[PDB]
């Protein structure tokens, strides 16, 4: 045959993220001693658009814990995070929007964003716009809170894990129809060479497992096995069910 496009994206050549104009990683502050035994006040300096990203990123400027210099630092913004706002990261941070305080100290039922799964990893869950995760339980005896991932998905993480308070900003992007082929041209301009998506049945038999034939049709089930070798694992992958739900 010939290499499938799903496999070629793994070369990550043409298919790499753009990101020249990206501001850098949008993370939480390094889990300092100050985070673990107090709090760091950083004022939000400016809320930026990172191209290719939905959520605005904030520019909180924490003062450096150990030296005379000030440490501007960039994290995806919770909604209502205005410039000049004083963020408070740390274990005994007050419970407010934008504050980053230990997950086990956040009240059960309150919704948090930019949650970190592993302790100290600097915020990986609930980072996309509009996204958040409600804390659904604490377990102080074993120090592991549960939380509901932005997908209907429960997950247990240590309470020492940081989280930010509130919904991530920029929510509701997806609600607006794109309408133009050109409009989606630009949302992916800042993302990657993801787009346009040619259908595999429109492709040739060399190009794709679905490709080829006179009427353009898949010839075999589109629901591929989990163990299917790459270049084969196209169509619906390890699908448990198909059909509209």
């Amino acid at each position: 045959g010939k290499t499938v496009l799903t496999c070629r994206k793994g070369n990550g050549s043409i298919y790499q993220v753009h990101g020249h104009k990206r501001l850098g990683p949008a993370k939480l502050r390094i889990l300092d001693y100050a985070e673990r035994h107090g709090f760091m006040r950083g004022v939000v300096k400016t809320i930026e658009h990172e191209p290719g990203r939905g959520a605005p990123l904030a520019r909180v400027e924490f003062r450096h814990p150990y030296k005379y210099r000030r440490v501007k630092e960039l994290m995806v913004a919770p909604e209502g995070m205005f410039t000049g706002q004083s963020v408070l990261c740390g274990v005994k941070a007050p419970l407010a929007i934008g504050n980053v305080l230990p997950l086990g100290q956040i009240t059960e039922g309150c919704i948090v964003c930019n949650v970190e799964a592993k302790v100290g990893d600097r915020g990986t869950i609930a980072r996309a716009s509009g996204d958040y995760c409600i804390i659904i339980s604490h377990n102080h005896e074993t120090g592991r809170t549960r939380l509901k991932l932005p997908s209907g998905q429960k997950k247990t993480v240590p309470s020492n894990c940081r989280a930010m308070i509130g919904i991530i900003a920029g929510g509701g992007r997806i609600e607006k129809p794109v309408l133009k082929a050109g409009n989606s041209f630009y949302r992916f301009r800042g993302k990657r060479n993801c787009w346009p998506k040619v259908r595999g049945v429109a492709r040739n038999p060399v190009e794709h497992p679905h490709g080829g034939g006179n009427h353009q049709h898949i010839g075999h089930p589109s629901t591929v096995s989990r163990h299917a070798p790459p270049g084969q694992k196209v169509g619906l992958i390890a699908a448990r069910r198909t059909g509209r739900i």
Binding site: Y33, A34, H37, M40, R41, P65, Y66, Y68
Partner: protein
């Protein structure tokens, strides 16, 4: 002009970070190599080098070795125009003195690059019933012999003035090793907890 050093106030004056610094790899590894072999369960054959001659006894013995120096190159040449009693030194010479049992005390060093060089030696003195002692450093057997390191030393013989000074040492020495040879061939060593984990266990049992 006092300074607050609460979090988020005055910047701290530069406190020592040796404990959390990132060291050169050879430093981290000689530290960990030492940690690693306390907390593993060492074999009785190899643990015995961890057990060692009491220093007040050691210091006495190395002063004895120093009393019977090998002749210096300057003098050995000068003697040969025609040897003085001295401690046998060297793994090969000391190994003979054990087997020939001419040795009447032997001083295995505690530390050795491959302990294998000497790891067998305590069993070999125990077999020839030669008194032997392990001692803290090949560097001290070193200077005692004027070498910068000595894997071993053998007091094969001594002048009459130091006969008893050797004998009490031979029985203050095989009192700890050769007499305990039944004990030594038994004690599995190691398995020490970190005192960061001994105390953690001191407190978990404190809470229960």
């Amino acid at each position: 002009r006092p300074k607050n050093f609460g979090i988020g106030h005055d910047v701290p004056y530069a406190r020592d970070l040796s404990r959390f610094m990132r060291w050169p790899t050879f430093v981290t590894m000689q530290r960990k190599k030492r940690v690693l072999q306390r907390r593993l369960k060492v074999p009785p054959a190899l643990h015995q080098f961890t057990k060692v001659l009491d220093r007040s006894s050691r210091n006495e013995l190395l002063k004895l070795v120093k009393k019977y120096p090998s002749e210096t190159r300057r003098a050995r040449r000068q003697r040969l125009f025609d040897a003085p009693l001295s401690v046998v030194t060297g793994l090969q010479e000391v190994t003979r003195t054990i087997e020939k049992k001419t040795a009447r005390l032997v001083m295995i060093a505690n530390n050795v690059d491959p302990i294998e060089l000497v790891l067998w030696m305590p069993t070999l003195c125990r077999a020839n019933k030669v008194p032997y002692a392990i001692v803290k450093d090949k560097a001290r057997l070193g200077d005692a012999v004027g070498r910068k390191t000595a894997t071993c030393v053998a007091i094969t013989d001594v002048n009459a003035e130091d006969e008893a000074a050797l004998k009490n040492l031979i029985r203050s020495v095989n009192a700890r090793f050769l007499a305990r040879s039944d004990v030594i061939r038994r004690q599995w060593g190691g398995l020490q907890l970190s005192l960061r984990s001994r105390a953690e266990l001191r407190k978990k049992r404190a809470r229960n």
